[PDB]
Amino acid sequence: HQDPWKLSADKPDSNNYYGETVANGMIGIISSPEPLKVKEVVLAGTYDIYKRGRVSSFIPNYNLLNMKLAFNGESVQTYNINNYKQELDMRNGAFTGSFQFKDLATVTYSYYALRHLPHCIMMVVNINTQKDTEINVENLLETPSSLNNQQNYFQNITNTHVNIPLLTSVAFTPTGRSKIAVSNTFLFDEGKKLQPEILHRMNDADMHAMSFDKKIKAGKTYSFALIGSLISSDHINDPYNEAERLTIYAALEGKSRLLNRHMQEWNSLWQSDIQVEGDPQAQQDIRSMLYHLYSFTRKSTSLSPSPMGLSGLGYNGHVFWDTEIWMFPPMLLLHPEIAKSMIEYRYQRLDAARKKAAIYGYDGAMFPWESADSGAEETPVNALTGAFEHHVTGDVAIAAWQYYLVTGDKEWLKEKGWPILKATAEFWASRVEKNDKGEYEIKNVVAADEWAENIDNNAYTNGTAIRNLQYASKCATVLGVIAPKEWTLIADKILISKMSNGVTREHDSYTDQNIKQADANLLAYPLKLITDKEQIERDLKYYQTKIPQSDTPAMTQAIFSLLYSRLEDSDQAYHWFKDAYQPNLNPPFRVISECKGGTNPYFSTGAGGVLQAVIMGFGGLDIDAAGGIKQVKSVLPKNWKKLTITGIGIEKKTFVLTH
Amino acid sequence: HQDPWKLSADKPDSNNYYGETVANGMIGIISSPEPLKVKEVVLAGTYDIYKRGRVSSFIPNYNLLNMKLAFNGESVQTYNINNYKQELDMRNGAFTGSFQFKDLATVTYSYYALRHLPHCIMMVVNINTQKDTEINVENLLETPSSLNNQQNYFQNITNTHVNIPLLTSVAFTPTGRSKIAVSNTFLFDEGKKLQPEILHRMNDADMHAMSFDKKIKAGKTYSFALIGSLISSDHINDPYNEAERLTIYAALEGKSRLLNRHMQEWNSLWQSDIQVEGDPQAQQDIRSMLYHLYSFTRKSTSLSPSPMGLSGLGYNGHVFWDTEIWMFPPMLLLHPEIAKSMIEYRYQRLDAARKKAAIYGYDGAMFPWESADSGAEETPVNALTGAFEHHVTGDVAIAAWQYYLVTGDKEWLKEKGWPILKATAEFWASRVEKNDKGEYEIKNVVAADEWAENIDNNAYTNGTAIRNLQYASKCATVLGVIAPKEWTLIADKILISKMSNGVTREHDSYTDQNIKQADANLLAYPLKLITDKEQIERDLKYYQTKIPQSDTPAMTQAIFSLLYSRLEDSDQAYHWFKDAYQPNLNPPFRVISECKGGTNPYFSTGAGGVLQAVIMGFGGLDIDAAGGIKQVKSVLPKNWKKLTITGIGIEKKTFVLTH
Ligand SMILES: O[C@H]1[C@H](O)[C@@H](O)CN2CC[C@H](O)[C@H]12
Ligand SMILES: O[C@H]1[C@H](O)[C@@H](O)CN2CC[C@H](O)[C@H]12
Ligand SMILES: O[C@H]1[C@H](O)[C@@H](O)CN2CC[C@H](O)[C@H]12
Ligand SMILES: O[C@H]1[C@H](O)[C@@H](O)CN2CC[C@H](O)[C@H]12
């Protein structure tokens, strides 16, 4: 089960099973331990009030691939099949199940979130008979109880060449905010005259289904595919007609054309890759991390991933600084067009950030702690982060500036990056308070260490303010504009304090408390405000044991690893690399939970950080403050013979590291 | 009762009481004669169909500060209080009541529309008892009859340090257009363990309340605050969660931090001030006028005041040329950032003006007579002003050009000013008709003198067209773009005619009719098309007695005053200054009604005009046609020993005038 491209499970155990996701950055499909079922389907960009937090959320959507198969009237179930296996092929995001049904047939099915068609999904089923048999196949469209006011339709789209039977449902999110349309069809190889007749049943309020029978002689392969389109009023004006249109189009493209396009797009994604010799387990784990980030983002969009991407409803689908600081940097180096989508999400939401600042008594743009459709604040009101954790504004500025550093796109800097940098700097200029000594303070925040609430002069927050003001000032120079001289004055006098032992103090009330996650250490990486190796080391020694084992997110140990790599300490770097994610795994596919021993995968934020530990730490790769990518000193794990990182920077460079 | 900073009323008489307003440009709170109550609360930017005119209106909102206080079960009433006094502190917009309850305790309360937090209010209550006693306090959220489909909630927001009890209501404006949320909490000094238990009652369909009891020992002062947030779907997508978020935020900022920020913002506003020596009554009156304008506007927004600002529902909250010509000029000189918001309102509504022009058969932008949320026409259809009073378009142009003259901001001129000037000049170019003699006429309008309906070649209207065309042409030159030569050709030949006595004729059917308000005289000031002193004087002599005493708005005598000041006639200037507002006052705070002996305060338009009579007339200050502020000859009232005007223009100049 340590293939470098494929994650495999024998005999899924539903009592201890965490499903894997396939996704195209628009739809995510999460696996069920049951054959020919899916657990959950999530559509990006569709939010309504629903369950957790009393705020907007991703909505469980139609499990559009759900299928029932019977052989001579006997329904196929976990209990009456054998040699059942599942496999995720990370090369093309194919999820495949295979099993034997008694003495009758082998069944294999593969499904896909098509990479070129954001709103289309396909499942291909192959039946190989050992005896004469008759299959009954049913595709069910069950309206999830997250939706309401559903309608269940069925029709035949015909001409002289085709009969495309469309199974369509239309329904609404809880408050009516979004209209969802789903339309499915079967694809056959045998042609209009010989294809099975499709029956339609509407026997329940919340479910209808299309079905057929097919006799298959012993020794034959019979194949069919289900194609489905899933779209909403958040994506298109008329989702009903558009879903049907899309499914007709896809059906007429056909399975082979669809998969070829899909494969070509996945091939391009994997032109940026990480290869490790001497550690098959690391190789597979890292490939999984890349696979998840690639599946949970999409170039040429304004979409940004939640902490759980499209693996489910984790954290309501909301967008956090997890994108800017954790998922964005690895994607910026490997596929800058993906990073461009992530920053586009914030650029499009700059007006909402301007509104938030005004409501809370500040200038410029104040990005929300949690963001969704509008760009307004979406944090649950019971969490003080929403009102008080303000570093997110600086996080967005840092990412904006980095986008320009790595691409060198001055047109983008003028049209998009400067609007962000200017407004965010205006925010910080209005957010600081000057004291009697001429220092600038940022008082009453929630720290990056979120356990420290309503404290003053948080190290990370203050650091992000400094960087935002500096980058805005640098941006202004690049574009030949005059930046307020106050931005530099303020940046140079924002307080960052040391305790009497010379360690960076996390906030003004900090002595020796346990902390949730890295904060002061973030000044060393990513901010690079602390570059002195002795200071980096002192801060590591003091804070590394301050993070408890329980209830602490995977936003710490990857940074420790990276910093120990930059200090050329292989043993410590490797220790922290493993600790960053191996204690957070769930079976059978080694998906990553938020915390150690947690059960809420897939925490793409954690993957993002670990990828930085590999690329920026072990690989020594770094965003050069004067432009482009450079390489600094690094070390590898003892047991790693070679590290190869491909497709880095706009020059698409390959980096090879050995002992 | 002639403190220069405070308006005071002893023992409010509810049979003859017109309340005063505190406001932050977003929320206005109007006083009740009753202790611990408010009369009315208005939120800017929220409009729906409601009562007058069958068009969009401000909506009476939650009286969110309404409180009941009892001492040992005995509620506070008219009959059991003494030494009851109210005071408005204009320095910081604090409305304070104080009273003695029997011989047992003294009570003070102060409330604020917080200046830095547009959507937050606070009331602070202090109780000093002379014997041991127990108070019961109730805060009530009554849904006004203007709203529907209300929901009444209560909950505790906790952590190890705090228990913030939130009293929240959500409701809808009449047609469902806007969702309103209000959320209140109590602030205590004593901390979570010792603070009173908060009870919740929901005994009515349209009212719920939170309450507590507190024992107070003899000789001690007990203090608490009520904080409330009031916001709508016009302001934020999710007003429900945003109100609760805001109130939590405010509570954790705390009273002292909130009032410090409030005070700092008010301090800045009063850096522009008018000081009069030798007339305490004038000094107080003028401070009131400045106070109301400062309270009813907001820098760094796109908000514009209605004729009654946030003092009530007067004229449905709509925006009229009252802003551009009456409130905007004094604010442009004192605080250009306030003027900037006023013109921003129009800029953001340029599309809607373009739509109006197209619908009425013209080119360019035709600004509506009455504006609200969209920028479309909002005048009641029974008033011919909405279809036919077209000078508003010229008024917006004049203000836009003046903004540039006073700031010299060429970037603003390019991005915003020119778009307005260009489109408005295109309107006038399409609005005029050329006659046989080569003159340009503007036929079938309602005059600035609104009593003249469906007449031709109104003096003021024609003059605004001339200026709009001139200013647009000059703008084009500044920016180096080529302006249609037709604009100057037209401007030079727009008809303005004289009667046989050499007086400017109001319109083509005018001989000697009574007029509603200044019209022909407006050509002298503000337009400055008539500069010849003998002409100005003849127009004054003819028209000054044409305005009746009754049913004529405070949009005339201030201009007469200013013009007599420019003619250096102190007696006439002072006569008209007093006549402009003193006959319009309502007790006990000397608020200003629209007309003489009227009962509909507060007419902020009138204050705006009178402020021009003071600044531009007595002070001699003037917007120079070539840029900046200049000073022309003027006189003072005999009894005024000194006039000091501070914070004028972008140089923030002080002007001092004596006899
Ligand atoms: O942004 C992080 C935060 O830094 C952590 O304390 C964990 N949080 C949980 C949800 C999201 O991942 C968020
Ligand atoms: O804002 C986030 C925070 O970043 C996370 O650590 C988890 N919290 C739980 C509720 C809310 O989503 C809040
Ligand atoms: O614009 C003015 C108009 O010039 C006057 O005749 C009175 N009107 C009443 C409402 C608003 O003040 C409007
Ligand atoms: O247009 C305004 C006019 O400017 C005012 O003098 C009052 N009028 C009454 C109805 C309507 O608001 C109309």
Residue type, B329: P
User: Between helices A604-612 and A280-295, what is the axis angle to 10°?
Assistant: 120
Residues 6+ apart with CB under 8 A from A602: A21, A292, A308, A309, A311, A312, A591, A592
- Among B47, B308, B315, B517, which is best to mutate for testing ligand 4, by the most ligand atoms less than 8 A from CB? B315
Residues of B within the annotated binding site for beta-D-glucose? 52, 321-322, 369-370, 385, 450-451, 516-517, 551
* Residue B107, CA distances (Å) to A96, A189, B73, B209, B212 in order: 75, 87, 16, 21, 17
* Phi/psi of residue B273, nearest 5 degrees: -150, 165
Please say whether the beta carbons of B312 and B30 come within 8 A.
Answer: yes
How far is B186 from B196, CA to CA, in rounded Å?
10
Whether A244 contacts chain B with CB within 8 A: no
How many Cβ atoms sit within 10 Å of the Cβ of residue B145?
8
Whether A218 contacts chain B with CB within 8 A: no
How far, rounded to the nearest angstrom, does the alpha carbon of residue A551 sit from its chain's CA centroid?
21
How far, rounded to the nearest angstrom, does the alpha carbon of residue B624 sit from its chain's CA centroid?
26
Please say whether the beta carbons of B540 and B563 come within 8 A.
Answer: yes
Are A359 and B246 a contacting pair at CB < 8 A? yes
How many Cβ atoms sit within 10 Å of the Cβ of residue A351?
13
Are A54 and B241 a contacting pair at CB < 8 A? yes
Confirm whether residue A321 is marked as ligand binding: yes
* Residue A557, CA distances (Å) to A92, A355, A553, A563, A584 in order: 30, 36, 9, 10, 12
Of A468, A471, A475, nearest to A409 by C-alpha is: A475
How far is A184 from A182, CA to CA, in rounded Å?
7
Q: Tokens for B434, please give them.
A: 């050329």
SS3 assignment, position A266: helix
Instruction: Find the closest chain A residue to B115 by CA distance.
Output: A361
Of A545, A543, A553, A501, nearest to A521 by C-alpha is: A543
Residue identified by tokens 């915390």 is A595
Which B residues, 100 through 119, put their C-beta within 8 Å of a C-beta on chain A?
A: 116-119
Residue identified by tokens 């599942």 is A86
SS3 assignment, position A593: coil
User: Nearest residue CA, atom 4 of ligand 2?
Assistant: A385
Please say whether the beta carbons of B602 and B309 come within 8 A.
Answer: yes
Instruction: Give the residues surrounding ligand 3 with Cβ less than 6 Å away.
Output: B 307, 315, 320-322, 450, 516-517, 553, 555, 605
Beta-bridged to residue A658, according to DSSP, are A642
How far is A421 from A397, CA to CA, in rounded Å?
5
End-to-end Cα spacing for chain B: 28
How far is B212 from B137, CA to CA, in rounded Å?
5
Which residues in B244-341 belong to E strands, given as ranges? Answer: 274-277
Residue type, A347: Y
User: Nearest residue CA, atom 8 of ligand 4?
Assistant: B383
* Phi/psi of residue B370, nearest 5 degrees: -125, 130
How many Cβ atoms sit within 10 Å of the Cβ of residue A247?
25
Most A-contacting residue of B249, B258, B268, B301 (CB-CB within 10 A), to test interface: B249
Please say whether the beta carbons of A222 and A147 come within 8 A.
Answer: no
Whether A56 contacts chain B with CB within 8 A: yes
Of B181, B171, B168, nearest to B235 by C-alpha is: B181
How far, rounded to the nearest angstrom, does the alpha carbon of residue A376 sit from its chain's CA centroid?
21
Beta-bridged to residue A110, according to DSSP, are A96, A124
Rounded to the nearest angstrom, the distance between the alpha carbon of B469 and the centre of ligand 3 is 24
Residues 6+ apart with CB under 8 A from B485: none
Most A-contacting residue of B114, B120, B237 (CB-CB within 10 A), to test interface: B237
Q: Tokens for B7, please give them.
A: 């308006």
- Residue A384: its chain B contacts at CB < 8 A? 159, 248, 252
Ligand in closest contact with the CA of B308: 3
Of A586, A32, A628, A136, nearest to A333 by C-alpha is: A628
| Overall resolution, Å | 1.6
Of B31, B42, B29, B27, nearest to B9 by C-alpha is: B31
Q: Helices H, strands E: what count in chain B? A: 17, 30
Ligand in closest contact with the CA of A598: 1
* Residue A188, CA distances (Å) to A38, A202, A223, A226, A255 in order: 22, 23, 7, 9, 9
Whether B237 contacts chain A with CB within 8 A: yes
Please say whether the beta carbons of B8 and B87 come within 8 A.
Answer: yes
Of A39, A37, A41, nearest to A28 by C-alpha is: A41
Are B238 and A384 a contacting pair at CB < 8 A? no
Q: Tokens for A3, please give them.
A: 């293939």
Whether A375 contacts chain B with CB within 8 A: no
- Residue B410: its chain A contacts at CB < 8 A? none
Please say whether the beta carbons of B311 and B37 come within 8 A.
Answer: no
Q: Tokens for A347, please give them.
A: 């650029």
Q: Would the CA dihedral through A425, A426, A431, A433 be positive or negative?
A: positive
Whether B236 contacts chain A with CB within 8 A: yes
Of B613, B628, B556, B607, nearest to B297 by C-alpha is: B607
Whether A441 contacts chain B with CB within 8 A: no
From the list B118, B119, B237, the residue facing A374 with the nearest CB is B237
Catalytic machinery residues of A: 450, 594
How far is B460 from B440, CA to CA, in rounded Å?
15
Are A376 and B119 a contacting pair at CB < 8 A? no
How far is A115 from A299, CA to CA, in rounded Å?
11
Of B375, B352, B353, nearest to B365 by C-alpha is: B353
Rounded to the nearest angstrom, the distance between the alpha carbon of A396 and the centre of ligand 1 is 15
SS3 assignment, position B595: strand
